[PDB]
Design a protein around this nucleic acid. Structure first.
Ligand SMILES: [Mg+2]
Ligand SMILES: [Mg+2]
Ligand SMILES: [Mg+2]
Ligand SMILES: [Mg+2]
Ligand SMILES: [Mg+2]
Ligand SMILES: [Mg+2]
Ligand SMILES: [Mg+2]
Ligand SMILES: [Mg+2]
Ligand SMILES: [Mg+2]
Ligand SMILES: [Mg+2]
Ligand SMILES: [Mg+2]
Lengths: 125, 138
RNA sequence: AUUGAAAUC
RNA sequence: UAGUA
RNA sequence: UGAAUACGUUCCCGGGCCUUGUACACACCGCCCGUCACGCCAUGGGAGCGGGCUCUACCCGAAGUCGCCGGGAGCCUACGGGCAGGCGCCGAGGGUAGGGCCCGUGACUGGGGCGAAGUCGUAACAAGGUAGCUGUACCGGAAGGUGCGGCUGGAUCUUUCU
RNA sequence: UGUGGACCCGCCCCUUGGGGUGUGUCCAAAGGGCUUUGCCCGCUUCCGGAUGGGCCCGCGUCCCAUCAGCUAGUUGGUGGGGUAAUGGCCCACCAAGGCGACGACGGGUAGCCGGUCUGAGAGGAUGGCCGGCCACAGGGGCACUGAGACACGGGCCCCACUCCUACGGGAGGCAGCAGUUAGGAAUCUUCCGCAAUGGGCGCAAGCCUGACGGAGCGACGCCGCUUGGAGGAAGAAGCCCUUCGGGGUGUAAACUCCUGAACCCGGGACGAAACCCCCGACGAGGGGACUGACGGUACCGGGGUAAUAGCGCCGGCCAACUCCGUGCCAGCAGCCGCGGUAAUACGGAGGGCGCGAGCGUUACCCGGAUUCACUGGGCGUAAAGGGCGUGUAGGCGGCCUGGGGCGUCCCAUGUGAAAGACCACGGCUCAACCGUGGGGGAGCGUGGGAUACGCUCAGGCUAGACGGUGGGAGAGGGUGGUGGAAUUCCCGGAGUAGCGGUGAAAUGCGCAGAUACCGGGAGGAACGCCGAUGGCGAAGGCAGCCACCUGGUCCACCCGUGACGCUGAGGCGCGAAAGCGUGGGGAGCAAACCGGAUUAGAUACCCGGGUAGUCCACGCCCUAAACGAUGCGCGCUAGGUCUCUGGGUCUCCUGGGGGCCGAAGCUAACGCGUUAAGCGCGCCGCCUGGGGAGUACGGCCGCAAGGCUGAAACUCAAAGGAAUUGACGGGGGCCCGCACAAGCGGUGGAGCAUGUGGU
C-alpha cells in the first residue's frame, strides 16, 4: 500500500488464539470424571481408544485422553489434565496425567517411566 | 503531470543504459544538472551537456559501458549497475552525517543533497553534513 | 469358511 | 464398499 | 480329397501413431455432489422466568462543610462577641414511573462442522452423455430444472452404478 | 516593645500577583537544666538557603467505527466565594458558545516508567523481584486536626459481613511480619537478634522499630563440588545377539597399591568503633571503655572411611539398532505418520545416543515467520482492482529568480538519577554474587550557524492543463415522425383432406373447410442485405430511414490564458438481465402451469399449448463471469504486419483509435511485451491458509424480494496456481488384426465322453 495509506491505516497485528482453553493459561487443570467411553478414531486408523469427559474447575466440560496400557477410571474418578491433542480423535484436545489423583500409574512399565507415571522398580534393583 | 523529475531522470538513464544506447535527452533543470556532475566526476557516465530541442532546454547524457565480452551474450558489463531513488515525493528521506550509508563497502556512491550543496557520501561525511538522501549508484 | 477387513454362508 | 502403490 | 467370401472400415471387441480436454495418477472397474438416516461437537433465533449496569422525570434524604437566624428562649461575656440549638442549599445513598442495555436460564426451533466400509439417485470433472458457470425469478425427494440477460473460465469445422 | 512583616491608597523600578517606597491601620514570644552571673536545651518576628511538594503547559502513551455525532457548569464573560495558589474548583447574573474522520462521544482491556526477555536489526512481548512516580486500605460519601492527611494499624454517616448483647444497643477491618482457612496446578517459619545500617522521640543514658540484619523450609533459578585415582585378560562370570566359527557389555568388574567427600578431635574470626566517659574548649585532635543475632558458623591445624545416579531419547526432521513379544489388537504420534504374523516407529530385553543432581512434560513470550513486509510483501489465471463516472476533504505537484528559515543539516551547552547492560581492575580458595572506575545514547529545552531539497511569500516564463479559429468520422444520448420484409388474427376469392410435429411417435389443429395459393384489412414487436478482424460511449450499453434538440472525441494553424495540474476517502449521479408499484399495451416468444412423449423412474432434456413477463409511460430495486477476471494519470524503453479516422510535400510521412507478432526486460509458469503484466514517480481501492460463510448479530437502505457493511465458536493439513509424464473421453485425424462386414462349417436343442459348479 502507499505510504499515505500506511499512515492512514497502519498494518494490523496478527493475534492467533489458544489451542487449549484449560482456561487461565494454567499448565494443568483439575477434573472430575463424568463418562469413560471408548472411542473409534478416523482417517486410516482403527482401535478402541480410551477417553474421559471431564467437568473442569474452569466451568468447562471437555473430552480428554487416557494414555498408557490399562487404566482405573470411572464416573467419579477425579483427574489432572495437561492438554495435548490426540489427532486421530477429532475434538480431543487434552490428556489425562497418569500418576496424580485417582488416576493410577502404569504397572510393569519399564521404559518411559516418567511419563505414564510409574515409580522405579526393585527386581535385580 | 510528471511527479518526480529527479526519478524520471534516474530512470531515463536506467532505461537507455539497458539497451546500450550512446546518449539520452532529459528535460533540463539546475538540480538535474547537479546530480549529473557527481555522476560524471565519479566516472559512471562520460558526461553531459546542455542543448535545445524544439525551442526547449534538455541535457544530453553520454553513457558509458564496459568492453564487449566473451562468450554467448557479448553484451558489455555496465558501468552503472544500479541507480535508485530514495527520498521520494511520497516519502522524503533525510539523514544526518552520523547515519550516512556506506554503499557497497566503498565501491558505491550515495548522492545526497545538503545545505553545502549536492554531494557524495564521503564528500558530505568529510564536510560533516547530512541531508535529503537523494539516491544511490553502484 | 473367503481376503487384512467390512459385507456374505 | 474401507485401509493399502 | 479340397471349397465359399472379402464392397468396404460406419458400427462391436483389441490395438498402433499424432493432436485435444481433464477436477483422473487405486489412473473411467477412475473421480465425485445433495437429501435421508446413525453418533459426537460447537453454534444462531427464542415466549416466559431470573439477576446486573444505565439514562431521563418526580419524590424522600445520613454524615458533613458552607449560608441564615441564634429570640423577653438555654449557657459564657470585658457587651463588641462566643457557644448550645434551630432553619436551609448541596449531598452517599434510597423510592416510583418510563426508556435504552448486558448476563443467566430458556420450552419450542434453524442451519453448521466432524465421524473405516447405511439409503436414493447421478448434478460436476472428457462434448461428463442436455457444454459449464453465472445474476435473478418461478418450480422440485434430492442432487437440480426451466425462463431472461451475461461470460469462455466450452470441444467440434441408445442407459445408471463399481 | 515593632528588628521587622501583613493589608488599603499613592508614587517609583520591573513587567501577569516581582522589588522598593510614604502616610494610615494591624501582628510577636516560653520556659526548662545546670559542672549556676555563663553556659546549655528550647521560644518569637523577619529575609535567605537547603530538602520535600502543589497547580499549569508542549509532545508521547492498547483494542473496537458492527460506537458518529457529543455537550447545560456545557464554552466564554462580569462580579463573588474558596484555596498556600491558578482555574466553571463552586455560585449568582449576561452571551451562545465548546468538542469531533488529525476519530469527539460510547464499549472493551490496563497501574505507568527505569528496565526484563527475545531479535542481525528494525521491531515484538513484558512491567514479578530491585529502584522512581501514581492509586487504593471491606464497598461508598465526608470533613476535623495539622507544616503536611481528606489519614491501612485517627474520626463521622450509609451499605454489606463477623462477634458481644440484660434486645435498648455496642465492638471490629492482616493489600504490616509470621500463621489459619477458602479458591487454586502452585507459592515458606506462628523462627534469632536490634550486634550492623536506616528511622522516631530524648541534652544524654537509653526506650521503640516483623524497616532491617540473620537463620529455617522449596533443586524454584544461577554458580561451585562429591559418588573415586593409577594399575588391572587377547578378556572371568552372568545377560544380549550368533552363518554356531564367534561378536558385545568390557578395563568395565574381581583383585594390587594410592588419595581420603563424609564423620571425630583441637583451635576459632572479620563484620565494631562510634555514641559515651577522660585530656583539650561541649570545637580540632588525643586517650579510654562497653557491645556479635548470625555462631562455637566461616576459616586454620590433626585424625580419618572407596564412599549416590538418575531421566529422556534411537522411523525422518534429529545424535543413536538388534532379539524377542504383539497382530488396524493392545498401543504410539510435535508434524509428516507407525500397528492388518518378520514392526530399527507399539511393550520388554540387550546395546546405543544426549544430558547429568538432575532429566522429561504442560502452559505462556520473542524467534525462525520478508506469514501485517518502515527496514521488508503483494492483487491477469494462486487470497486480492471498487460495476462506471463526477467530483469534497486529503495526499501529490513543471522551468527560472528573489525574500523568509517552519521541515531538514551542523556546533556548542543543559537534561538523560542510582541500579541494570557494556569494558576494565579488584573481593569472597574459583565462580555465581559483590565492589571501585570508565565508556557511551536517541528524545527534548537553549544559544549560534547552512539554505541544496521540501514548505511558504513575491515576481517571472511556456514544454503540463484549458480556451480560439478552421476541418473531421461515429449503432454516443433524448424527442417526435415515418418505411418495408416477416409472423399472428379478421374479411373476401379460389380450392380439398389433411396439416403439424419426431429418433420414432403422440398430444394438437382440420369437413363450422384447416394446411398450401391470390387479394384486402387490423395490430404488436424487431429491423435482412450493408455488417467487418469495423465504429461510438466512462461503464452498463448503443444497429431501418428522416428531422429537431444535445454529449463526448480526433486533427491542423501555433492565435489566446499562464500551472489554472494529477488522483480522489466520504457525497452525488449513471448502472444489463431478472424483479417490484400504478396505468396502458399484448403480435411472436415464454418461467409457473396443463397436456403428449422417453425412462428402471423422468417433478428433465424432445413435442403441443400457456399465465406472469418480455413492449410503452411514470416511479422503485442497484446486482452480475458489471471480464481485459488487468484502477486513474504522466514520463521512459527495438521493430514488423493488418486496420478505422485525420492531416502533409500523399512510394510513404505525421497524429488519434483497433488487432496480431514479437528487442530489452518481467513472470511459478502460461504469458505480457509503445493498447506492458517493462523500467519509474503520484493518488485511490483491495488481500493475508481452507471449511464454517457473504452465514450470524448489529447498523443503514428498500413497498417487497432483497442489497451494502460483515464476524466467532468449532474443525482440517491442507485449500490453491501453471506447467509434466501417463491413463482416460458417449473429443478430433490417420492406421492395423478373422475385429465387423462378405462367406463356409459349427456350439446353444438330443444321447453319450470328459472337466467344473452345486448338492
Ligand atoms: Mg486402515
Ligand atoms: Mg469407489
Ligand atoms: Mg515412545
Ligand atoms: Mg515479523
Ligand atoms: Mg474494472
Ligand atoms: Mg477525478
Ligand atoms: Mg579474582
Ligand atoms: Mg426489465
Ligand atoms: Mg411491471
Ligand atoms: Mg414448450
Ligand atoms: Mg448476496
Amino acid at each position: 500500500p502507499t505510504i499515505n495509506q500506511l499512515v492512514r491505516k497502519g498494518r494490523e497485528k496478527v493475534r492467533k488464539k489458544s489451542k487449549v482453553p484449560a482456561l487461565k493459561g494454567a499448565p494443568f487443570r483439575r477434573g472430575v470424571c463424568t463418562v469413560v467411553r471408548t472411542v473409534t478414531p478416523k482417517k486410516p486408523n482403527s482401535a478402541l481408544r480410551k477417553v474421559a469427559k471431564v467437568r473442569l474447575t474452569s466451568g468447562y466440560e471437555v473430552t480428554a485422553y487416557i494414555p498408557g496400557e490399562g487404566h482405573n477410571l470411572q464416573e467419579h474418578s477425579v483427574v489432572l489434565i495437561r492438554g495435548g491433542r490426540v489427532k486421530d480423535l477429532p475434538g480431543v484436545r487434552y490428556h489425562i496425567v497418569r500418576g496424580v489423583y485417582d488416576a493410577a500409574g502404569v504397572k510393569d512399565r519399564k521404559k518411559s517411566r516418567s511419563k505414564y507415571g510409574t515409580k522405579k522398580p526393585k527386581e535385580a534393583a | 503531470m510528471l511527479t518526480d523529475p529527479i526519478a524520471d531522470m534516474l530512470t531515463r538513464i536506467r532505461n537507455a543504459t539497458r539497451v546500450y544506447k550512446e546518449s539520452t535527452d532529459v528535460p533540463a533543470s539546475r538540480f538535474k544538472e547537479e546530480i549529473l556532475r557527481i555522476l560524471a566526476r565519479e566516472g559512471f557516465i562520460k558526461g553531459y551537456e546542455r542543448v535545445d530541442v524544439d525551442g526547449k532546454p534538455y541535457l544530453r547524457v553520454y553513457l558509458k559501458y564496459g568492453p564487449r565480452r566473451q562468450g554467448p551474450d557479448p553484451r558489455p558489463e555496465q558501468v552503472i549497475h544500479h541507480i535508485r531513488r530514495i527520498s521520494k515525493p511520497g516519502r522524503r528521506v533525510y539523514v544526518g552525517v552520523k547515519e550516512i550509508p556506506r554503499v557497497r563497502r566503498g565501491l558505491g556512491i550515495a548522492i545526497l543533497s545538503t545545505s553545502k550543496g549536492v554531494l557524495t557520501d564521503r564528500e558530505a561525511r568529510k564536510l560533516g553534513v547530512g541531508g535529503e538522501l537523494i539516491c544511490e549508484v553502484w
